Structure 1
Amino acid sequence: QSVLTQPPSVSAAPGQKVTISCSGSSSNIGNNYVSWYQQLPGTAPKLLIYDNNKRPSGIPDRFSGSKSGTSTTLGITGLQTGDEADYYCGTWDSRLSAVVFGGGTKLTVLGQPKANPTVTLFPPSSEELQANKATLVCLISDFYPGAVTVAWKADGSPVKAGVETTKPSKQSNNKYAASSYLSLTPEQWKSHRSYSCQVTHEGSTVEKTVAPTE
């Protein structure tokens, strides 16, 4: 539940330009200076933009920042594969008296056609129920870009407790895979009629369902 809202991912082809928006309220972006950070895989974040639209030395003019009301935008032109990174906006929040970050945006520089994920959802095995445990396993494969959002539901209601989801990573065929697991007790598994794994990828959503009665 980040105070600032970024899209989880954006993409474009090499040479093209992209924007990343960050949205907040009057207590943060509306009345405080925004900075942007780039985080290459495995590294610490690097400052891209400060004071809404200034670049530190060594940051090329391909990167730019702008502001309108309670939103800010990072622009990147002339996309290179080296720009692939997670991008974060940050500012001070006057109501919290705290630094607040957006949730991050993964930037993919398209190196292949976009691909939809295949989703498979397995219920707990009877053997596992005999061990007094219950794991629902949602498997997600063959997708690109490498970003998905996973949401679980019990009889249509959101469930957040007991969810563990991996970071997507490359398969041998150069698409991505991820998995999400929902941990329940045998009792809470048997007491609902339906559990669902909902996977969102580039605007499209696939939802799979299982039930104890199967």
Structure 2
Amino acid sequence: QSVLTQPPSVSAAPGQKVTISCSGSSSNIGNHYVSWYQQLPGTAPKLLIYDNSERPSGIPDRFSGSKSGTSATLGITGLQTGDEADYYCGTWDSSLSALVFGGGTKLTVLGQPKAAPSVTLFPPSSEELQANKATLVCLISDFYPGAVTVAWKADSSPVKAGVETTTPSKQSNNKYAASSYLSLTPEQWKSHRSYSCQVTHEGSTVEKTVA
């Protein structure tokens, strides 16, 4: 829920070029100048493009920006491993009386080839079992690239309630991974004869089972 409209996610091949678009109105992009900010996986974003088409010194000519009417565009040629980050389009709005930005566009420059998530889930603990607080743990690791849609198959049906799942993030070996916890009462686990964690990436499904 931002002001400017950017595309949520783009991906492409190393060595290729990508364009990120920014959609606005008269009040923002219409009459005022636009800027582009590269925020990395973590840490403070930096100025990439300013005044539509200007690069700060040290920002290479592989990048450029363009703008016409109520939309602007960021171009990146010679796409490289380091480039994958969240990209923000920023301009000035005269009607809102505020500096405004796009939602942000996440980049996943394909550095390596696809990897399968070999999911390993654990059930209620003996302690938790008698402690009247069963927390189903289904941890996903060593997969590439991007976030994996996670779900909890429950008693021959779906289940979305009391469920949290972390963001995909790569480790030392650059394997992006996340974790999901299903919180039930002991009774919720007793009557229901079956339970499963349903995990999906770019391609295919791999789900485990607990009873």
Please tell me the TM-score bracket, short chain as reference: 0.5 to 0.7
Distance, in Å, in 2 between the alignment partners of 1:97 and 1:68 is 22
Q: TM-score, normalised by structure 2?
A: 0.65
Distance, in Å, in 1 between the alignment partners of 2:79 and 2:201 is 22
Contact 1:140 1:178 in 2 (8 A): yes
Distance, in Å, in 1 between the alignment partners of 2:17 and 2:65 is 13
Relative to 1, partners in 2 of residues 1:208 and 1:5: Cα closer, same or farther, differing over 3 Å? farther
1:116-145 CA-partner distances (Å, limit 9, x unpaired): 667899999999799787878675555432
Of the structure 1 ranges 82-91 and 20-29, higher mean CA displacement relative to structure 2 is found in: 20-29
Residue identity (%): 95
1:60-101 CA-partner distances (Å, limit 9, x unpaired): 211111124333221100112222322111122333222222
**What residue is the counterpart of 1:184 in the other structure?**
184
Tell me the CA shift for residue 36 of structure 1: 0.2
Relative to 1, partners in 2 of residues 1:187 and 1:116: Cα closer, same or farther, differing over 3 Å? same
Contact 1:199 1:207 in 2 (8 A): yes
Q: Which SS does the other structure have where 1:127 is aligned?
A: helix
Residue correspondences, number: 211
Contact 1:146 1:175 in 2 (8 A): no
Structure 2 residue ranges without an equivalent (≥5): none
Q: TM-score, normalised by structure 1?
A: 0.64
Of the structure 1 ranges 184-193 and 28-37, higher mean CA displacement relative to structure 2 is found in: 184-193
Of the structure 1 ranges 26-35 and 202-211, higher mean CA displacement relative to structure 2 is found in: 202-211
Relative to 1, partners in 2 of residues 1:31 and 1:183: Cα closer, same or farther, differing over 3 Å? farther
Tell me the CA shift for residue 35 of structure 1: 0.5
Relative to 1, partners in 2 of residues 1:127 and 1:108: Cα closer, same or farther, differing over 3 Å? same
More strand by share: 1
Contact 1:9 1:147 in 2 (8 A): no
Of the structure 1 ranges 88-97 and 156-165, higher mean CA displacement relative to structure 2 is found in: 156-165
Structure 1 residue ranges without an equivalent (≥5): none
Relative to 1, partners in 2 of residues 1:142 and 1:187: Cα closer, same or farther, differing over 3 Å? same
Relative to 1, partners in 2 of residues 1:63 and 1:183: Cα closer, same or farther, differing over 3 Å? farther
Of the structure 1 ranges 29-38 and 150-159, higher mean CA displacement relative to structure 2 is found in: 150-159
Of the structure 1 ranges 7-16 and 173-182, higher mean CA displacement relative to structure 2 is found in: 173-182
Relative to 1, partners in 2 of residues 1:47 and 1:171: Cα closer, same or farther, differing over 3 Å? closer
Tell me the CA shift for residue 53 of structure 1: 1.6
